[PDB]
Design a protein around this ligand. Sequence first.
Ligand SMILES: CCc1ccccc1-c1ccc(CNCCc2nc3cc(Cl)c(Cl)cc3[nH]2)cc1Cl
Lengths: 317, 327
Amino acid sequence: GPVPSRARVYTDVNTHRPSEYWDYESHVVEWGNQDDYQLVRKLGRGKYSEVFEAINITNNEKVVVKILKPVKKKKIKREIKILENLRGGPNIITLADIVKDPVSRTPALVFEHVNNTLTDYDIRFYMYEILKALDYCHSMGIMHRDVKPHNVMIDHEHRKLRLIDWGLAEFYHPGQEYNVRVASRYFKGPELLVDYQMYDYSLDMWSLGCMLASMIFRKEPFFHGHDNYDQLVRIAKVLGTEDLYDYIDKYNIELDPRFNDILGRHSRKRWERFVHSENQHLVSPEALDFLDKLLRYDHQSRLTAREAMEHPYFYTV
Amino acid sequence: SGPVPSRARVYTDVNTHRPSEYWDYESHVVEWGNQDDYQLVRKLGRGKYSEVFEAINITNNEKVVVKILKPVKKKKIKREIKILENLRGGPNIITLADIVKDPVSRTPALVFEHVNNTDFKQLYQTLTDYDIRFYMYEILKALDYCHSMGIMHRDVKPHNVMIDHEHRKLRLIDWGLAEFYHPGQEYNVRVASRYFKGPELLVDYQMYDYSLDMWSLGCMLASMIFRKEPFFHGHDNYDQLVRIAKVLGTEDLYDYIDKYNIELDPRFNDILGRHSRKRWERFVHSENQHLVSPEALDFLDKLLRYDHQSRLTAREAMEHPYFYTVV
Ligand SMILES: CCc1ccccc1-c1ccc(CNCCc2nc3cc(Cl)c(Cl)cc3[nH]2)cc1Cl
């Protein structure tokens, strides 16, 4: 079978905490009355959720209400426990309340309102704001597992950032085998794509690297896969096939036969080739060195959030 | 021309503004699962038309509580289930987990979350002023929630409050007497347990509301802070009003009946007498002085009022100085 792996940072943070912290299945959720919130308008719709702008009638404050389609109760307990553990943390969305409408009885989460609205400095600034949230949640023993631009809200007028949608987040336990059907296709780490289950917080750093590459190069998404197998091929077209085989061999990973006719052979490309007239004002040696240190096949060889915060790319923030 | 009408000062029209599916429990369709998934372990207690068992959910090896109902009134079972379903998941409300029937007996059974009830007597000896403020606040969270949901419990008493002291967890149980509040509705006064019956029930004033629960909570608070169980020890429902009048006085009882044009039952004529209004300080003794304070007495005085409209609502009670020391 596959070779075991563990996180280089915050490895045992949950092991040293009582089970009440991480045993979300045993968490008792107490649903308040949704009558204290008046729904104003529909903001958007997700896979098993509808998001509304609302007003808290007790204090006249605008909030956001996420009405969840309860397809999996254990998953709702997980998201609430994680939101409660992280409540008030730097750049983490604030869970304000947990309520149910008296008639429908549909689970609803109430969040702080974010008025969601670039230069080389703006990218360094906001990348540092995301790192504050990631180093915090990793220190809290939590992997987000769905880092992407849609899950990052920015109020640019107030230079405020929030990391949202904790629905795929999980608690990190060393040696635990996790479900690889996480994150969104363009941001899926190589470990998920090859079915390597013993992954960690480093999955989030790969996704952050995909975001940085798209911003500095103005190429959205950076790795444009059309399916999960193809997604690995798009990565291999940049990182090369030699280092992919070194990765699978290091961890004794069995490659799925679906990769046989599509993977091919690819050279490792240099980051400088993605620089063009339209993006050169956002690119620098420091930006490329930092990106190269995030986008690595081997999950263990990527910068941790703490390490990334010490990179020369952030000397100006 | 009869009694003066009355309505709740809070959550008055919460059911009026909801579709009938919410409160029309007679029309609620109950689906009963297979009780075979639960193995009964031991009998916990027995009530009037119910037997309570500790049981084990065989699908997950978790302890649960099974309440087997003697189906003497089907409408009442529908009422209890609809209320439990409406309140499910609310703060400190017992959680209805399942509704089942044994394949052979076909007897209605409700499955609840398990509460590890610490023995009260052991707790009673060691209870502190802080613990009483803490647990009283926990009951108020449950009452403000159920009143906001348009429901009166109508059977608030210590036997219906389960506390796991080790985990500082409290649950309000036995929703069998609970009812939906509709303004102007005349309710049956034969509810609540004798010692906890509000004056409205005792004088046969039918148009009562959520404030009935606040009187019963006041009876519990008085028994805890003064270590006098029960506080108002009536021997029958008429004598129960006399016990209250021996504390609250007869002057304010006549003001209450006059405000609502209530006709006092002739059975009170030879037993009520005349009684002065007592100071709450008179119930303080060496055995209970560590649980009493000016704030505790001011709060008690504001719950134990004849006039149901004059009592603090649950939300008002939560703002009282007595709770300044609780989170
Ligand atoms: C500090 C607590 C307090 C403050 C103010 C007023 C009263 C009390 C109080 C005093 C005692 C109790 C304990 N009630 C337990 C009743 C009970 N235990 C049960 C155990 C079982 Cl198994 C069953 Cl079936 C029913 C049960 N009902 C609850 C309470 Cl809430």
